[model samples]
Target chain A: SPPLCTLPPGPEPPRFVCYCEGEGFNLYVTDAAELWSTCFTPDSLAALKARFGLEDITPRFRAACEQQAVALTLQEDRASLTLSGGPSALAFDLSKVPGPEAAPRLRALTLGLAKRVWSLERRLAA
Target chain B: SPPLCTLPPGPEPPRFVCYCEGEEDRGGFNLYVTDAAELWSTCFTPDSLAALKARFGLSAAEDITPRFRAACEQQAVALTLQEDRASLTLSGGPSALAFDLSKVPGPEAAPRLRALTLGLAKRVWSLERRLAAA
Candidate 1:
C-alpha cells in the first residue's frame, strides 16, 4: 500500500506476506507452533508441532519472543510458494517431496488458516 | 547455542530460519531482489524478480524498511521448507502450480542458482563469522 518501498523498515515484528507465485502455496511462520495451533485443528496442529520439536508452548518467556505467523496457500496444481520477510524473498516447490498426496491437503489447510488470519488483519487495519 | 526460546525475542530484526520440514527446499527472502540478485546470477535473479513484480531495489529510505531476506532451502525430495520469521511459521508446496518444468526446474537452471545462494549464505555465516572472531 505504501509504495512497497516506504512501507516499513525491517528489524520490525514478523508478519505474513502471502502471494500466488511460481507454483504451489507458501506460508512463512515465525511462531510455527502458536500460529499453527491457533489456525489448525488442535490435534493436527499439535502433532505437527511435536514432530518438529516445537511443542513447548507454555513457556511464558518463549511466548513473548515469538513473532507473528505468516503463510501462503497455492492451488494443488502448483507446487511452490514464495513470501517476503525480514530481508529476502523465498520460494520452494512441493512436487519434489516424497508424499505428494498429503502435501496438497496440508497446503489447503494452511491456506484456510491464512485466509482466516488475513481477515483478522483486515479487521485490525479497519 | 541458547535454547531456541531463550535465543531471542520478537520485535527483533527478521533473519533467515532454514529447516527441512515437510517437503522440498524453502528460502524466505525479506529483501527479495537485493538479496536475490546478490545471491543469484544477475540475469536469472532479475528474471525471477521481474516475474514477481519485485524489480526495483529498495531505496535508501526504503531500503531501511526492507527486512533481511529470509529463505528455506529444502531438498526437492522433501517438498516443504519451514522458516520462523517475525511471528508466524509458514509452509507451502510447489506442486500446486501448472508450470511443472519451470516450477521445480524438473531439469533446469533454477535449482543451481538456489544452490549458489545457499553456498553464499554458508560463507557469510561460517567464513565471515570466523573472520570476525579471529
Candidate 2:
C-alpha cells in the first residue's frame, strides 16, 4: 500500500464562552506628584478598578493615575473588553480566553482604552 | 467717511519659536508584584524618564525598565528632538512649537523635549498593548 499523508483540522470548539467587556483610557499628568493626585478621584478610578477588578492589587495604576497617561478598562463579561485613551479605542473578545490570559487581556484593554480617549482630543491650529 | 471696515489677517506669529515633542507608550503587568519587577530595567525606564524630564525631575530612570514600552529622544539643537516608542513615530518643526511670550526661550526646552517624545507615540501599539509584553 502507498504511504498516506494527512493533515488534521483545527482544534475543537471552545467548551464555554465567557463574555468580557472592558474600556481602557489614559490620564495625563503634569508632574510625578500630580500622578498621585487622581487617587482621590473616586469616580474615575472606580471605573478603572471595576474594569479589571484590580482595585486592591496594582499600586502602579494608582501611580499612573496621578501624572502620566494611564490606560484602563472595565470588562463587562468574559467575552468583550473596551479600551480608550488619547487617540485610541479598541474592543476585545475573550470567548476562547487563552491560557494564562487574564493579565494580557487586561493590558490590551487598557491600550485600546487609551487610543479611544486620544482620538477625542481636539487638534490645535498651528 | 463711513467707519473703515477692515478684515485683519490671522493673529501675529509667536515671538519665540520653542519646539516641543513627546511620545506615549504602555507597560503591562501580570499582577502588582510583576509590575514592580520590571522596574529594575533602568535603560528601558531611561527612555520614559527622558520623555518627561521636566515634569518629574526623576532622580533615576531605573524602575520602569521592565514591563513597559517607553518613549525617548535626544535633540540635536534648539529645533529638533527625535523620539521612539512602540510602533508609532512622528516629528515636528519649530513652527509647531507654542509657548507664552513671558517665559524665556532657554527654559522651554523641557516641554519641547516631551512633545517630540509624545509625537512618536501619537499612534502606537506595543506588546504591553497586545495583552502584556510576554
Candidate 3:
C-alpha cells in the first residue's frame, strides 16, 4: 500500500502535471526538479512520502531546482518549462492523473502521490 | 532542391529513428543519418561531439541536404537534411537511418552509438505514448 495523505477538502482531480526524464518532447525536462517546480502540491508530496522510498531521488532534483534557472508557464492546465538555456523546453498537460508508474524516480514517486489524491477523491465522494 | 550526396547505391528506405527536443508522435516516418553525429549534431557540446566523432566515421560535413520519404503503418513522412538541421526532427520508418556505428566495418563507435540509441529510444517511445495520454 502507498502512503496516504490526509488531504483537506478541496477540488477533486487537482490541476497539475507530473514528469520524469524523457524524449519525443522538449528535451530539457529530463529529471525530477523540473517537474517539482510546477504545480505539485504539498498534499501530493506528503502522499509520495507515504509511498516510495525517495532515498536515492531527492538529492539532485533539489540541486537542479536550486539553480533558480527554470522558466515555467502555466496555461491550459499545462506547464511549459525552459531549463537548458536554449531553444528546447517541456510542456506538460496537468489534466492527466499521475499514475504510480511514472518515472525518473522522484517524479514517479510524485505521480504515485497524485494517484493517492485521486483515490481519496473517489472515497470522499461516496 | 535538397543537396544530393554521392551516397552509396543503397536501400531506398533505410531503417531507424531520429530525435529532437519535444513532444512528437514519430511512430511512422523515414529519416537519414549520413553521419551518426547528425542525429544530435545540432545540440551536442564540442566535448560531446568530440566524444562521439572519436568513435565513428562521420561523413564529410556537407552542404548537401538529402530528401527522403518514409511510409508504413498507415502513415508517411518526409525530410530534407541540411548541414545544420533536418526538416523532420523526429522520425522512424523502413529507411529512417538510425545510426549504429558498431555495425559498420570497424572496431568503431557503432556499438556504443547503437547502445546509446537503444536506451534513448526506449524512453522516447514510452514518452510518445504518455505524451498523448497527458
Best by lDDT: 3
Chain B TM, per prediction: 0.22, 0.16, 0.25
What is the alpha-carbon lDDT of model 2 when measured against the actual structure?
0.24
Write one digit per residue (lDDT tens) for candidate 2, span A1-126.
Answer: 000000111133211111112223332221100111122245765665566455342233323322323332323322332333323343333332232433343333323323322222211101
lDDT of each: 0.25, 0.24, 0.30
TM-score of each prediction: 0.20, 0.19, 0.18
Per-residue accuracy of model 1 over B13-42 as CA lDDT, tens digit each? 222222111111632222211111111111
Q: On a 0 to 100 scale, what is the lDDT of residue A57 in model 3?
A: 30
DockQ of each candidate relative to the true complex: 0.02, 0.02, 0.02
Better of 2 and 3 by lDDT: 3
User: On a 0 to 1 DockQ scale, where is model 3?
Assistant: 0.02
Interface RMSD of each: 17.6, 19.9, 17.4
Model 2, chain B only, scores a TM-score of: 0.16
* Model 2 residue A21 CA deviation in Å: 2.4
Tens digits of lDDT, candidate 1, A35-125: 1112234575456446534533323111221221223333433433332343333333333223453344333433333222222233343
